[PDB]
Design a protein around this motif. Structure first.
Motif, short mmCIF file in Angstrom:
data_model
loop_
_atom_site.label_atom_id
_atom_site.label_comp_id
_atom_site.label_asym_id
_atom_site.label_seq_id
_atom_site.Cartn_x
_atom_site.Cartn_y
_atom_site.Cartn_z
N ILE A 160 -28.58 40.85 91.66
CA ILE A 160 -29.15 39.53 91.97
C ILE A 160 -28.65 38.93 93.33
O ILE A 160 -29.38 38.17 93.97
N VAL A 173 -17.20 40.28 101.46
CA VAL A 173 -18.33 40.29 100.54
C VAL A 173 -19.59 39.94 101.34
O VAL A 173 -19.70 38.82 101.84
N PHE A 199 -13.00 39.91 89.60
CA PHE A 199 -13.21 40.10 91.05
C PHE A 199 -11.88 40.09 91.82
O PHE A 199 -11.69 40.92 92.70
N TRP A 256 -18.68 36.54 103.14
CA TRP A 256 -17.52 35.85 102.57
C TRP A 256 -16.35 36.76 102.91
O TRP A 256 -16.48 37.99 102.81
N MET A 277 -25.70 36.73 95.71
CA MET A 277 -25.13 35.39 95.58
C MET A 277 -25.64 34.50 96.69
O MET A 277 -25.75 34.95 97.84
N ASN A 304 -18.75 43.59 87.60
CA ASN A 304 -19.36 42.44 88.33
C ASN A 304 -20.73 42.88 88.84
O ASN A 304 -21.71 42.16 88.66
N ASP A 342 -23.18 29.70 95.36
CA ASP A 342 -22.42 30.61 94.47
C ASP A 342 -21.07 30.97 95.09
O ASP A 342 -20.03 30.86 94.41
N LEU A 343 -21.08 31.37 96.38
CA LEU A 343 -19.91 31.76 97.17
C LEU A 343 -18.89 30.66 97.39
O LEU A 343 -17.69 30.96 97.39
N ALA A 384 -24.56 41.71 87.79
CA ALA A 384 -25.54 41.29 88.82
C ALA A 384 -26.87 42.04 88.65
O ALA A 384 -27.94 41.46 88.85
N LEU A 425 -19.38 29.85 91.49
CA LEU A 425 -18.47 30.85 90.92
C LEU A 425 -17.01 30.39 90.88
O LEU A 425 -16.33 30.71 89.92
C1 LIG Z 1 -15.47 34.49 89.79
C2 LIG Z 1 -16.12 35.39 90.81
C3 LIG Z 1 -16.96 36.42 90.51
N1 LIG Z 1 -17.40 37.03 91.67
C4 LIG Z 1 -18.51 37.94 91.74
C5 LIG Z 1 -18.39 39.13 92.48
C6 LIG Z 1 -19.49 39.97 92.64
C7 LIG Z 1 -20.74 39.62 92.04
C8 LIG Z 1 -20.83 38.43 91.24
C9 LIG Z 1 -22.03 37.97 90.44
C10 LIG Z 1 -22.33 38.67 89.11
C11 LIG Z 1 -21.17 38.66 88.11
C12 LIG Z 1 -23.57 38.06 88.47
C13 LIG Z 1 -19.71 37.61 91.12
C14 LIG Z 1 -21.89 40.52 92.34
O1 LIG Z 1 -23.06 40.14 92.34
N2 LIG Z 1 -21.59 41.78 92.72
C15 LIG Z 1 -20.23 42.33 92.90
C16 LIG Z 1 -19.33 41.25 93.43
C17 LIG Z 1 -16.82 36.35 92.74
C18 LIG Z 1 -16.01 35.35 92.24
C19 LIG Z 1 -15.27 34.51 93.21
O2 LIG Z 1 -14.60 33.55 92.85
C20 LIG Z 1 -15.38 34.83 94.68
C21 LIG Z 1 -16.73 35.43 95.12
C22 LIG Z 1 -17.83 34.37 95.05
C23 LIG Z 1 -16.62 35.94 96.56
C24 LIG Z 1 -17.07 36.61 94.20
#
Ligand SMILES: Cc1cn(-c2cc3c(c(CC(C)C)c2)C(=O)NCC3)c2c1C(=O)CC(C)(C)C2
Length: 209
Positions: free
Chosen positions: A81, A135, A123, A147, A83, A36, A87-88, A40, A92
């Motif tokens: 990048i 988060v 995640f 979060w 969130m 993840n 996105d939170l 990012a 996502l």
């Molecule tokens: C799917 C998903 C994926 N992730 C997630 C979790 C993370 C990251 C990203 C974005 C990149 C993949 C571009 C996405 C990130 O930027 N760093 C590590 C944690 C999450 C989710 C959730 O549903 C809950 C959330 C928004 C707290 C975190």
């Protein structure tokens, strides 16, 4: 001000499955969170090629693994990048709805929990080892947010009062009592070598004083 939200029905169902299913190969949580973070980092690196000012919030592209035996926490820090609030809460979660449905259908069809990443919901494997996940994230287009979820069908989103991050994400895993092996230097090294050896960014394991 703290806002409380209910997880999408499919997500709540996935979280319950991850927490209650007997599955010993829990170590896969680290490669999923690292993946993840790597995604990012890829995102901000790609975006910076057409707009170099996107790196004004920090040029270094890396992953930091910070175990803490006293607090019983494993922190994964990336300078990706980050969130936004959208996105939170929405973006996502909307993407995760279709992925979760497909993953749960595959699990019933014979697939194991380790295949979670192929459905883009990797995640949530954090809940194999953590009772609570925090988060802390900062995206260029938004403020710093916190979060948090201990599962049970809900999550909280608040503007972060703590130390400014610049840009990126901090995943704080409040580990389950029986999952303290993931705080050991030797164990983390072994997991990184076995599952994340080819990640295109420096992975720094912070040794405890
Ligand atoms: C799917 C998903 C994926 N992730 C997630 C979790 C993370 C990251 C990203 C974005 C990149 C993949 C571009 C996405 C990130 O930027 N760093 C590590 C944690 C999450 C989710 C959730 O549903 C809950 C959330 C928004 C707290 C975190």
């Amino acid at each position: 001000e703290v806002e409380t939200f209910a997880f999408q029905a499919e997500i709540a169902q996935l979280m319950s499955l991850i927490i209650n299913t007997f599955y010993s190969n829990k170590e896969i949580f680290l490669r999923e969170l690292i993946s993840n973070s790597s995604d990012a980092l890829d995102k901000i690196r790609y975006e910076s090629l057409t707009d170099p000012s996107k790196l004004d919030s920090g040029k270094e592209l890396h992953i930091n693994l910070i175990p803490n035996k006293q607090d019983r926490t494993l922190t994964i820090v990336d300078t990706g990048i980050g969130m936004t609030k959208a996105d939170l809460i929405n973006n996502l979660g909307t993407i995760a709805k279709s992925g979760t449905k497909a993953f749960m259908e595959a699990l019933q069809a014979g697939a194991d929990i380790s295949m979670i990443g192929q459905f883009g919901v990797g995640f949530y494997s954090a809940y194999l080892v953590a009772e609570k996940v925090t988060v802390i994230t900062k995206h260029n287009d938004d403020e710093q947010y916190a979060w948090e979820s201990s599962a049970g069908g809900s999550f909280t989103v608040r503007t972060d009062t703590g130390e400014p991050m610049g840009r990126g994400t901090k995943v704080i895993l409040h580990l389950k009592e029986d999952q303290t092996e993931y705080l050991e230097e030797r164990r983390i090294k072994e997991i990184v070598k076995k599952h994340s050896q080819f990640i295109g960014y420096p992975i720094t394991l912070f040794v405890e004083k």
